C-alpha cells in the first residue's frame, strides 16, 4: 500500500523545488510533478525535508547505580515530535574492551526504539582485545569509534592510547569522534573549587573554561592528522575549539565540528540563577558557556567549518540533578533537546537568515548521513532513500514548554523559547510516526541502521597521506 | 529519439553510485538500475559526471582595437574537448553605462558558441544611465555584476561608485563579482618600475605583489556586507586574498570564492624563464604566484572556503603578447585554460586525494550552478536537468601539449602536464558534443542561459540584515 | 638653583628601584642612592615616573568658524593636572597645502602652552605645492605627517594621494599617521540613516561600524608597507583594527598603533543614554566601541602590538554639541580625556595588573617618544634628560568629576570613575608645574620640541626594502 | 684600578649614542661625553653594547654515560668569543627530584666556567620531595623550572605532574620553561620509522614535524595560564608554536618565546645532504625545519611576539654522533652556536634592516635579562650594572669555519657563514675576557649568578587572576531545593 505526499514544497540540501512524493516499501519510489498513490497525505503550504538525524544522544545512560530518565521509547518519541527520525546513541564498554558485550547490551535497551537508530562505539582504554574487537564492531555495521579526554578515573584515554586507537581507526577505514576537553586540568581545578568552598553549579563552568576545550580540541587534531584519519568532534562550544577545527581545515586537515543546539542558543548566565534547582538543571559538559560564543557556531554553520547540529541528549529529573547538592562534581551532567533540535534551530536560524533552508537540511540531516557513510539511505529525499521525512507547516507557532514535551523529565532548558515553524507529521521508513501533536510510532518500530567504513573522506586522506609519506634518503656506502 | 548512458558511475557533488542515464529531449528522463533507450551510449569502466561549468571566460574580448585569439567557437571546442559543457562570459560596457547596447554586441560574439553559455555584465563607471540599466540586465537573465578595482584609466571603480553599485544589486537581488587589485597601487608600482628599466615580463608580477590583491580582496568585502549583498571574488590567487575570505566568512559575512587552475598549479617562478616568450606568454592578472600559495588554494577547495574553480580564459598569440616587448603594462593579460581545467584538477587533486570525486563535482560544476542560481539545470545529475554530462575514463593518459590543444593559440601554459583520467566524451543537453577525440559541436549549437535574481544566500542575507539593522533611540521632549 | 627628588622609587619602561634625582638647568643630571641639591623635593612612599607623552591632541581646534573650547592654555593646564607634561597637535592646513603657513599659525595658539609641546602635520589633499613643503616642514623639526582617510569633502585623501604621500615621507626619513576610516563607505551610510530619520547621536556609531575602521587600517598598511616606510594608527577602537595591525607586524611589517583611554574603558551603550546631551556628548570618532574590544586593546598594550595610549584631547561644550540636535553629523566630533589619561590608565591597567607598572610608563611616554625620535630627551629617567617627571602617590583616592577638572567645557566622560593613584606634582623641564592641586606653570612656559627625522625603524625598514627589492631578469 | 672605554658608540635595548664609559670595581661607574680612567680601551669606530646573554646551554651535559664534548671551560670560551659574556645551563635531576643534589653537581661542572652563568633547574617527575625542594631551589637564586614535554621515559612529564609543578612555580613566584613536543606522538613515529626501515638521520626531523611541537606549546600555555603563572617557550622553532604564542599574547596570557639562531638561519634540507655525517652533525630537537619557517621567528622578533635568540648549545663530535648509525633515535641531539649566537644575528638581522641595532640588544641580552629578573646587573649599560660588555667592530669580517672556532668539536653547523661586524673585545665584570682572537678570561672567572623570584610579570599576572577570579553565587535557603 503505497503513500503520496502530494502538494508539498521538497527541501534538501541541495535545492528546494514543488514536488510530490511517492512512497513504496518504505522507501521513496518517485519524485515528481504529479503522482498518484493509494493514500494521500496533503502538504499544501508545507515543507517537506528529510526527517533529522541527531548523531548524538545518551538513552537510558547508566549513572551511579540508576540511569538517565529518557531511555530508546521517550527519547525516540521527543526525536520524532521534533522532525528527527534517527538517533546515533554511545555505547559505553568497560576499560577491558568488551566492546561486543557493551553492544549487546545496548541492543537490548535499543529494543525499545519507536524510530530508526545506530550507534557509536567508545573506547575506554587501551589492550589488545580492543584492537581485536574493533574490527568486528565495524563488521557488525559501526564505523565510528568516540574517545574522551576527559572523565579522568571513569572514561578518559592519554595521547598515548589515543594514537594507537587512531591508527587502529584508519586501518579500519574507521572514524573517530572526542570528547575534547583537558581531563587532568579539569580534574585538579574541580578538586580546587571544591577545596575552596566553590561548589555550587556556577562553579561547574569554573572547573571546565573554554580554553581546557580548545587545547584538547587542538591536540585531538594533531593525533588524527599524524594517525592520517578524519577526526568529527562533538559538542564544539566555544570560539577556542571552532579556532582549532577552522585552522586544521586551512591546512588540509580532514576535521568535522558539532554544534549542539544548546551552545547555539544557550549561555552560562543561567548558572549564576538565585535558584539552585535551575542552575543545576542546565550543568552539563561542556557547559553553556559565554553568550559571545553562539556568533561563532553560527557562522560556523554557514560557513562550512562546523558541519552538524546535535543535542548530547541526557535527562536527568530534577531529583537526579539534586545528587549534587553542595557537590557540583555529583551534578549529573546532561540536558535534553531531542525534540528542540529541529524546532529551534529552524527559527533561530531559518527564520533569521543566518541559515538558508538547504544549509538547515544539510545540518540537521544530510551532512552527518554523509559523514557516517549512510547517504542517501538517510538525510536523502532522492528516489530509493528511506522515507524518513518531516512535513513543515512554515506558519505553525508555539512556546516551548515542559508541560507539553515529549521527554520524560520535569523540565526544559528551552522553556518559553518562542517559535514558528513546526514539524506537523514525520515519516519513518514511510510509516507516519508522528501526527497531529501525537507519537504514534510504537516502541520497537525502529531499526538498527548497519553502516559500511571506509567513505570517500577517509579514503582521500589516506590516498593523500601515501602521497606525501616522507622516504629515506639514499646514502652511497 | 532518446539517448540511454549504460553501465558506467555516476559522480555527483553529494553522491557516487552506479546506475544507467535516460535521456529525452535533451534533459535527463530518468537514472536508476537498468533503463532502456533509442540510442546506447556504452560508459561501462567509466565515471558519468555532471558537465564542467567554467564562470570565468573572456572569449573574443576587446584588445587594442583587436580582441583576444580565443573566440566563442574555439573557445567552446576548447571547453569541450575538457568536459567543460558552459561558459560564463564578462560583457564589457563604456563608462557611460551603456550596458543593454553591451550585451546586444556579446549575444553577437556568442551566436558562434559550440555550447550553452552565459554572461556577467561588468560596471566600469557610475551614474543614472548604469544604474537604470543593471534592472534592465537583470530582467534579461544576466544576475551577476562585476566589478574591477584595478585597471586604472580603463575599467576600474572606486569604492564610492563600487558601493552605489553594491547597493544596487542589493535591491535587485543580484551578486556583485570583483576583481580585487588596488590599482591605485599597481599603476604607481608599474609607473615606477618602468621608470626604473624594470620592464620586462617578470616586472608585470613585482608591480602587484599579493599584498596589493589581499587588501582590496577585503575592501570589496567590506562594502559589500556593508551594502547587505554576498560577494563573489573572482581569481583568487593567493594566501593574503583567501584569507580575508575565510575571516569574512568567519564573522558570517557571505563571500564566494574562486580559485583558477593556473593558481593551483602554476607559480611565479615561470616568468624568470630566461626566454622572453616564454615568460610574456604566462603573463596574466593576477600573476602567477609563489608557489606556496598553491596549498593555501587547494586547502580552500577541501574545506569549502573556495568553492569554483575557473581559468580566466583569455587566450593571446605570442604574436599578441610581443605587443608588450620592452614595456610589460602592453603585455596583453591572459592565459588559457578552458580545455586543461578539468583534467588538470583531476589528476593533481582526484587521484593525489586532495579533493573527493563528489568535491571535483562540487568545484567544477555543481557549486556555481547553485551560486548563479540555475541549480539544477547545469550542475546536476537529476530528473529534469538539462543533460550537460561528460564521461569520465580514469585510466586514460596524455601528455598536455600545444600540438593538440583545440585552443586556436601556439602555446600550452600547461605545456607537459601529465595526465591520467579523461574526458572520452561530453553531451550538452543530450547532444553528443565531443567524441573520440573530436568537437561534434556545431557553432550555434549553445544557447544563452538565463538566471533569476534573488537566490537563497541573497534572500537570506537580506533577512540577517533587516533583524540586525540598528534602530533610532526613542526619546521623549 | 638646583632641585633633589629625595626619598621616591623611580619606575622606567625598563626597570623599577629608590633612587634620589638630582635635577639642574632644566634636565636631570644625577640619579642614585643619595643625593642633595638646594631645594628638596620629599617623594617619600611615592613613585617617580617620567611625564606623559599625549601624541593625539586638537587643542583650539578649528570648527564651523568657531575652535574647540579647549585651548593650548586650557588643554596643557589639563595635562599637567593629569601627570602628563607634553602634548603632541594637528596641525591643519587647507587641501592647497599651504602647510607652513598652517604651521605659522599653530605656532600662534601653542604660545598659551603650559607645558612642552610638539606638533604632526596634517595633509589634507596632494599637490606639487604639497610635495615641495613636506621637505620644508621636515627642516622644521616636525617628522610625522598625519592623513585622513574620513571626512570626505574636508580632509579626506585617496589611495593615489595617500601612496604618493607616502612615497615622500619615506624619502625625507618621515613617518606618516592615519585617521583610518573609510570615508566613502561613511558618507554613504551617514546619507541613509538620516535619509531613513534614523538621526540621533546612536547613529553617529551606525554610520561607521567597526568593520570600517578595520578595513581602512588594513589598507593604509598595505600602502606604507609598499611605500616602504613605517605607518602610525592612531586611535585603533575596535577588535578589527587591531588585527590588522597583529597581522601586518606578523608580516614584519613596521606598523605603530594607539589606542584612546575612551576605548579602554567606556563603550558604546553610552549612546543609547535617554538622555540626548548626555548621548551627544560622547560622539566622536571613532565611536564608543562595543565593550568587547576593551580586552583586545588592553591585550595589545600588554603584548607590544598596540604601543601608545592617547587622548585624542579635542573638547566641545554642551552648547556646541548641541549644534546636531535632529543630525548627528553635525554633532562636532571629541571627547576630552587630557587629564583623565593616565590616572585612569594606572587605576584600570597597574593597579589590576593588566600592565606592570614599567608598561605603563612604557605607552604613556617612552614608547611615543622612542617613536617620534625624541628618547631620551623625553620619556626618560636618564642623566641629560629633560626633567619632565611626574610624582605619583599611588595611596590617594579621588572619583573624577566635572566639577574638579581643569578642562574648559562643562562635562566629563570618566564621569564617576573612581581613582587611586594620582599625580601630586609635575615637572617640566625641573620647573614645579603641578602642586597641591593646583596648575603652577603659566601659560607660555611651554616650549616646542624639535624632532629628527630618519629614526631607527625607518632607516632598518628602509635597507630591509634595498635588500629585498625585486630585480631585471637578464636575457640576451 | 679604573678602565675607561673611550670613543665607542654605545648601543642599548633604548638608545644608540656616543660616549665614554667609566668602569671601577667590576661595575659601570659613569657614562658621558669625556671621561678618564687609569686604564684606556680605545672603542673608536666601535659600538659598545652589553655582553650576550645566552639562556640556553647544556654544557658538559650528561648521555649515554658519557658528556656531550664542550664543557663549562671550552663552553665558555666559546661564548666570550662570540661576545656573549653571560649563559645559562640547565640542571637536569633524576625523576625522585634530587634538586638540590642535582645543582650541586652543576655547581661542580661550571667550575671551570670562565664567564659568569646561571641555572634553570629541570623538573622530570612529580612527587614530595620535587615539591619541597623547588622552594629551596628557589632559596638559592634560581628562579626557572624546566618541564620536558617530550623525551618519554626520560625527561617527560605528562598533564598532571606540570600542571602540579605550574602551580608550585605560581606560589614561588618562579617561572615554568618548557621544551614543547608532543612526547607519546614522538616515541610512535620513532618506532613505526625505524620499523619501516626509514632509519636515517632525516627520519629524525620525519618524528617530530612541525604540528608536533605546535600542539604541545598550545598545551603548555593553556596549562600555564590554568595555573596563572608566566610561562617561557624555549627554541620555538616553527610557525605553528609561534603561532600558538601570539595567539595566546593576544588573549592577554603572559608567554615568552625563544627562537634559536639555528632555527633562524639553516633548514630541515641540510638532513638530505648525501653524506651521512654531514646530516647527523645537524640532528637536534627540534629539528632544523622548512625554511619557510625563518621569515615567521625573524618577524616575532621585530613585533616582540618573540623575545630573546638563544643556541640551546650540546656539542658533540662526529664519534658520538656516529653511536645513532642504522638507528636516528641514538644520534645525540644537539647543535653547537655559543659562539656563533651574535655575530650570525648581527651580520643577518641587524646589517640587513631586519632588526634595529638596539632591537638586537635586546633579544640578545637585555630582554632574557629583564624575563630572568637579573636587569640592569646584566643586559644594562647603565651606571652600578656588571660591566659585561662586548666592544663590536662593525667593519671586520670573516668566514666562520670549524678550523678556527673555539668549540671542542670538529665541525660547525655555520660552516662557510660570511659575516661582517665582529667582536673584537669582550669584558666580563670589567676584565678583559677577550681580546683579539684569543679567549684570555681563565677557567674559575666566572661566577654564580643569583636571581630573586616574584618579577613584575609574575606579580602583575597573580594579581590579574585575583581581579578575575570566578565566585560562589549567594544564593539564599529561599532558593535553594
Ligand atoms: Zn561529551
Ligand atoms: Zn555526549
Ligand atoms: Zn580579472
Ligand atoms: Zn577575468
Ligand atoms: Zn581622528
Ligand atoms: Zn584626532
Ligand atoms: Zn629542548
Ligand atoms: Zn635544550
Chains 1, 2 share one sequence.
Not at 527541501?11 to 523545488?17: G, M, P, V
Not at 574541580?190 to 580554553?211: C, F, I, T, V, W
Not at 557547559?287 to 548530547?312: E, H, I, Y
Not at 522553556?415 to 501526527?435: C, H, Q, V, Y
Request: proline share 5%; aromatic share 8%.
Amino acid at each position: 500500500a503505497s503513500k503520496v505526499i502530494k502538494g508539498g514544497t521538497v527541501i534538501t540540501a541541495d535545492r528546494t523545488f514543488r514536488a510530490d512524493i511517492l512512497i513504496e516499501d518504505g522507501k521513496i519510489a518517485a519524485i515528481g510533478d504529479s503522482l498518484e498513490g493509494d493514500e494521500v497525505i496533503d502538504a499544501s503550504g508545507c515543507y517537506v525535508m528529510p526527517g533529522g538525524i541527531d548523531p548524538h544522544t545518551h538513552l537510558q545512560m547508566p549513572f551511579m547505580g540508576t540511569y538517565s530518565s529518557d531511555d530508546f521509547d521517550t527519547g525516540t518519541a521527543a526525536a520524532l515530535a521534533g522532525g528527527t527520525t534517527m538517533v546515533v546513541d554511545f555505547v559505553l564498554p568497560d576499560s577491558e574492551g568488551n566492546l561486543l558485550d557493551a553492544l549487546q547490551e545496548w541492543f537490548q535497551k535499543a529494543g525499545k526504539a519507536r524510530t530508526d537508530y545506530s550507534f557509536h562505539m567508545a573506547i575506554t582504554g587501551w589492550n589488545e582485545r580492543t584492537f581485536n574487537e574493533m574490527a568486528e564492531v565495524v563488521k557488525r555495521g559501526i564505523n565510528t569509534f568516540k574517545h574522551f579526554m576527559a572523565y579522568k578515573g571513569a572514561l578518559m584515554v592519554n595521547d598515548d592510547e589515543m594514537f594507537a586507537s587512531f591508527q587502529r581507526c584508519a586501518e579500519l577505514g574507521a572514524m573517530p569522534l572526542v570528547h575534547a576537553e583537558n581531563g587532568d586540568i579539569v580534574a585538579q581545578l574541580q578538586a580546587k573549587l571544591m577545596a575552596e568552598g566553590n561548589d555550587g553549579p556556577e562553579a561547574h563552568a569554573y572547573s571546565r573554561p573554554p580554553e581546557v576545550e580548545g587545547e584538547a580540541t587542538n591536540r585531538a587534531i594533531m593525533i588524527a592528522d599524524q594517525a592520517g584519519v578524519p577526526l568529527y568532534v562533538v559538542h564544539v562550544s566555544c570560539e577556542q575549539s571552532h579556532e582549532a577545527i577552522r585552522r586544521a581545515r586551512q591546512k588540509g586537515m580532514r576535521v568535522f565540528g558539532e554544534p549542539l543546539i544548546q551552545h547555539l542558543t544557550l549561555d552560562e548566565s543561567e548558572y549564576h540563577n538565585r535558584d539552585w534547582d535551575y542552575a543545576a538543571r542546565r550543568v552539563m559538559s561542556p557547559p553553556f558557556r559565554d553568550k559571545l560564543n553562539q556568533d561563532s557556531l553560527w557562522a560556523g554553520l554557514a560557513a562550512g567549518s562546523l558541519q552538524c547540529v546535535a543535542t548530547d541528549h541526557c535527562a536527568f529529573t530534577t531529583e537526579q540533578k539534586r545528587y549534587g547538592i553542595g557537590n557540583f562534581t555529583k551534578i549529573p551532567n546532561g540536558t535534553g533537546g531531542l525534540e528542540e533540535r529541529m524546532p529551534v534551530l529552524w527559527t533561530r536560524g531559518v527564520r533569521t537568515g543566518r541559515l538558508t533552508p538547504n544549509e538547515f537540511v544539510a545540518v540537521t540531516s544530510t551532512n552527518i548521513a554523509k559523514i557516517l557513510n549512510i547517504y542517501p539511505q538517510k538525510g536523502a529525499v532522492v528516489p530509493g532513500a528511506d522515507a524518513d521525512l518531516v512535513i513543515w507547516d512554515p506558519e505553525t507557532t508555539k512556546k516551548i514548554s515542559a508541560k507539553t514535551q515529549h521527554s520524560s523529565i520535569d523540565y526544559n532548558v528551552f522553556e518559553g523559547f518562542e517559535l514558528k515553524g513546526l514539524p506537523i507529521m514525520t515519516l519513518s521508513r514511510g510509516r507516519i510516526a508522528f501526527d497531529k501533536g501525537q507519537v504514534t510510532a510504537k516502541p520497537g518500530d525502529g531499526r538498527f541502521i548497519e553502516r559500511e567504513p571506509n567513505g570517500a573522506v577517509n579514503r582521500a586522506l589516506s590516498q593523500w597521506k601515501e602521497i606525501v609519506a616522507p622516504r629515506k634518503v639514499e646514502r652511497s656506502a
